[PDB]
């Protein structure tokens, strides 16, 4: 539930 987590591979 964290909208600011890394949305990319790395």
């Amino acid at each position, epitope marked *: 539930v964290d*909208p*600011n*987590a*890394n*949305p*990319n*591979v*790395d």
Partner: antibody
Amino acid sequence: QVQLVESGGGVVQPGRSLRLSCAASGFTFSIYGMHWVRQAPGKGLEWVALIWYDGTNKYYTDSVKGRFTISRDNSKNTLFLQMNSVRAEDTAVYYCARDAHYSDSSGYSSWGYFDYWGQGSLVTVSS
Amino acid sequence: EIVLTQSPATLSLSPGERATLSCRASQSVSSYLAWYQQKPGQAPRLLIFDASIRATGIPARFSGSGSGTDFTLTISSLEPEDFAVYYCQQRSNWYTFGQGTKLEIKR
């Protein structure tokens, strides 16, 4: 080489649906998070939604939650915004934007900014 | 939500002059701030991220500083392609933008 080309804008009556498309070229689409950001006529920028590289997580701003759906088709290098139950206040230029997936040789990692943008697609919601 | 307040609303300057733009956050965003440039009819363009890191292909005359709640974008020598609207953006808590500062040509 990075390009983001949007399509699908136009006039839509209140309560109806419209789907925007954002076709990517010149980068590895399938490893980047992707966002939609909008700008109403003569106003500033407003984040709309975000989708992870693999499509597994999705986030929305409150005013569109339950009405808009973000999705992607990596085999076709395309990002989608499905806009249902549209309202006049949704009138805006809609931009897709690539998540600024930054890293360096030092392991330092950064994200959550918008490093490349589509040309914009105007959606006019009006009766 | 974190509100970003930009000042001044409009900055009236001439090519060659130093421009200094401010962005104030309603609470700390640590260093999770970016700056964008936008011209009429065009998409925005990322200039600076993580408060001070210049994006690829951005001229060295642009620089960012600050942390916590107060941030500055400086253009050391303004050039004609820099007359535009500038926005700040944070990614500390969701995604919000300032309301913009217009850098206009003085005459």
